[PDB]
Design an enzyme around this catalytic site. Structure first.
Site, mmCIF file in Angstrom:
data_model
loop_
_atom_site.group_PDB
_atom_site.id
_atom_site.type_symbol
_atom_site.label_atom_id
_atom_site.label_comp_id
_atom_site.label_asym_id
_atom_site.label_seq_id
_atom_site.Cartn_x
_atom_site.Cartn_y
_atom_site.Cartn_z
ATOM 1 C CG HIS A 11 -10.958 9.394 4.819
ATOM 2 N ND1 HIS A 11 -11.503 8.256 5.372
ATOM 3 C CD2 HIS A 11 -10.029 9.832 5.702
ATOM 4 C CE1 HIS A 11 -10.930 8.016 6.537
ATOM 5 N NE2 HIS A 11 -10.033 8.958 6.762
ATOM 6 C CE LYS A 38 -7.987 4.632 8.972
ATOM 7 N NZ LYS A 38 -8.211 5.889 8.188
ATOM 8 C CG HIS A 111 -9.515 13.225 11.614
ATOM 9 N ND1 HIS A 111 -9.028 11.951 11.405
ATOM 10 C CD2 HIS A 111 -10.348 13.138 12.679
ATOM 11 C CE1 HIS A 111 -9.546 11.132 12.304
ATOM 12 N NE2 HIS A 111 -10.350 11.828 13.088
#
Length: 119
Positions: A11, A38, A111
């Site tokens: 990310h 993904k 996350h």
């Protein structure tokens, strides 16, 4: 801290270039998110100190397990061309500037919540 590392790999991109469709296909391949493709993946831009700060003062609780940022972040979302997960993973980019929701572990981001920015 490996969990923190996986987060940055999936990310994070301090200084992007192009932020278009070609940027996504190249990035997803480079960060190893094409096996399998993904479905949706967002990259956060800027510095890393501000992302971890969300785990500290510059953040707020967003439920029991997540934190939401106090300020917006420049971000690029890469969406899969739902259809044909074969080696060639198709993607299209979408640039936005939103408040984000992450998950933290012992002070470190681990996350990113993709559903929070779906709308």
């Amino acid at each position: 801290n490996e969990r923190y590392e996986k987060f940055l790999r999936q990310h994070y991109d301090a200084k992007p270039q192009g932020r278009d469709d070609r940027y996504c296909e190249s990035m997803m391949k480079e960060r190893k998110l094409t096996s399998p493709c993904k479905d949706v993946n967002t990259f956060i831009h800027g510095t890393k100190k501000n992302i971890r700060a969300i785990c500290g003062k510059k953040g707020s609780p967003y439920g029991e397990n997540f934190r939401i940022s106090n300020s917006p972040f420049q971000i690029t979302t890469c969406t899969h061309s739902r259809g044909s997960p074969w080696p060639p993973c198709g993607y299209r980019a979408f640039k936005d500037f939103r408040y984000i929701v992450i998950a933290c572990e012992d002070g470190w981001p681990v996350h990113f919540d993709e559903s929070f920015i779906s709308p």
